[PDB]
């Protein structure tokens, strides 16, 4: 079976540790979210540590959990 360490295979890399990969890279992303009422775009980390409130609505659009940040309003996928 042909598997080569020098040229790293991207499919396995995702399952691998953020540090164990041939290059220790970020494993999280910035996601803009769509407030249903207004079209202001708020960028949020894939894992949020501090709450970001949608501009014009005082209530935080993201209540942080240990990893993924859920959103009270509908979610804009990643960057789209």
């Amino acid at each position: 079976m042909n598997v080569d360490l020098l040229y790293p295979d991207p499919v396995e890399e995702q399952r691998k540790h953020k540090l164990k990969r041939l290059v220790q890279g970020p494993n999280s992303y910035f996601l803009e979210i769509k407030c249903a009422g207004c079209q202001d775009i708020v960028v949020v980390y894939s894992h949020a540590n501090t709450p970001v409130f949608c501009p014009g609505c005082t209530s935080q659009i993201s209540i942080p959990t240990g990893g993924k940040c859920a959103f009270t309003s509908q979610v804009e996928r990643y960057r789209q």
């Binding site: 080569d4 360490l5 020098l6 790293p8 041939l22 290059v23 220790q24």
Partner: protein
């Protein structure tokens, strides 16, 4: 903690070759481990190598010819005069046919054979069987 990178690389390369895996990784690239690896490639024990580079320690991926019998390090470096180079060949080299001890001399870093012929003796970084 990790003081000797070459011992963690030498047993990295030797252990991998023992299982027969040609491609091996090394946690930190060192300009001195570059010297041992390229003197291994130069003598033909090891094959084409590469360092995937982050901005940090860097990881070394080396393909092997599969012929390595033994590699190792003398920790820490002990300096021998060019007069005593041969006593160290007796203890750490199997035979005088495939003898190679990595010496460090100010005028270039070479294996034992070339150095004594150049009449300069420095410190034994690591053993190469």
């Amino acid at each position: 903690v990790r003081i000797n990178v070459l011992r963690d690389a030498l047993k990295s390369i030797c252990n991998a070759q023992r299982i027969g895996k040609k491609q091996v990784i090394v946690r930190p690239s060192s300009k001195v481990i570059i010297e041992f690896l390229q003197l291994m490639q130069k003598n033909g024990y090891i094959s084409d190598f590469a360092v995937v580079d982050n901005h940090r320690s860097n990881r070394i991926v080396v393909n092997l010819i599969g012929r390595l019998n033994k590699a190792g390090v003398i920790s820490p470096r002990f300096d021998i005069p060019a007069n005593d180079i041969e006593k160290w060949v007796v203890n750490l080299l199997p035979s005088r046919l495939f003898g190679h001890i990595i010496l460090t001399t100010s005028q270039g870093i070479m294996d034992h054979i070339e150095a004594q012929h150049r009449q300069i003796g420095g410190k034994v970084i690591g053993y190469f069987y």
